[PDB]
Symmetry: C2
Subunit: 182 residues, 2 copies
């Protein structure tokens, strides 16, 4: 599956419940400026999931912001990659059994959004966040797609830890049977 | 999960795509009479998934109708069951790795709908369709909840085989990384 497909499916795991089904194309989007305003007012006692549509990098991914303190607020990054953009091909299983397990600082990925929105990023910043080995040599600057405005689009939702737990239980219960299905 | 949660998740696997997300509570529903009309004119060149809310049996489940001719048209039945009612406890994994991979006749499950809607319980019929072993002794006829009308509610959708394939790949991928999604 593509990075966008993986991202959409993760959103559904966090958000789907009786009476609401997440559908990427139908949900409300935020600009970077609007996002920055929401993140500045985020309470410590709520958890959020952020879907990132990264048009420069060529890639969609998820930032999970658990409940936490606003000083050095942690986050987790979830992604897969077909390897057609700046970053290399990356299987979800591989990302999620290695680098995804270590928290990052929300400020660091937000600094990336700010820099890349102005074409002011650098490969070391990109590799540190997105490459499984932090290896700058695996990036292809020649595959960047910068456009003066609107490089990024975002979707930001509050989530409940009970709901992602339940949805993961559901998909686990289907996995073996589904594979058999044709 | 409950039978209904399993059913709804299976509908999402068949149907979800860019610009469409299945949501059980908001979908259109068919009566049995409506479904019987639709089946009479169902295109042979298309595949369909049918979500069944079976009030009398007290159970929900999926009937997969692939492309095929309307004479003895094949179908597949997918289900789980917590075992509180007529039929016994059944894990989706167990059903799907045993009885589910053998096709059934669409006409046989349709005959069942017709019989149950008229309160003509046939325990052998129910075991043959729904029990992993086909064992009538495992059923509890006492737990049938026949009502005078509106026993059944259905949802019927066309599906594309490319989409179910893509969604199964996604679910297997997600399961492989699931430990990292919770903190």
């Amino acid at each position: 599956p593509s990075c966008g497909v993986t991202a959409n499916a993760i959103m559904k795991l966090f958000l789907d419940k009786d009476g609401f089904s997440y559908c990427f194309e139908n949900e409300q989007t935020l600009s970077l400026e609007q996002l920055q305003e929401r993140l500045s007012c985020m309470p410590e006692c709520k958890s959020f999931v952020l879907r990132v549509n990264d048009g420069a990098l060529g890639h969609a991914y998820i930032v999970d912001i658990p409940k936490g303190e606003n000083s050095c607020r942690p986050a987790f990054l979830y992604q897969s990659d077909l390897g057609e953009g700046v970053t290399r091909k990356l299987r979800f299983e591989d990302w999620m059994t290695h680098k995804a397990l270590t928290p990052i600082l929300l400020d660091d990925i937000c600094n990336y959004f700010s820099c890349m929105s102005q074409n002011k990023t650098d490969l070391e910043q990109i590799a540190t966040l997105f490459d499984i080995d932090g290896n700058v040599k695996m990036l292809r600057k020649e595959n960047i797609q910068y456009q003066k405005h609107d490089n990024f689009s975002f979707q930001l939702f509050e989530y409940d830890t009970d709901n992602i737990e339940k949805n993961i239980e559901i998909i686990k219960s289907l996995c073996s049977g589904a594979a058999a299905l044709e």
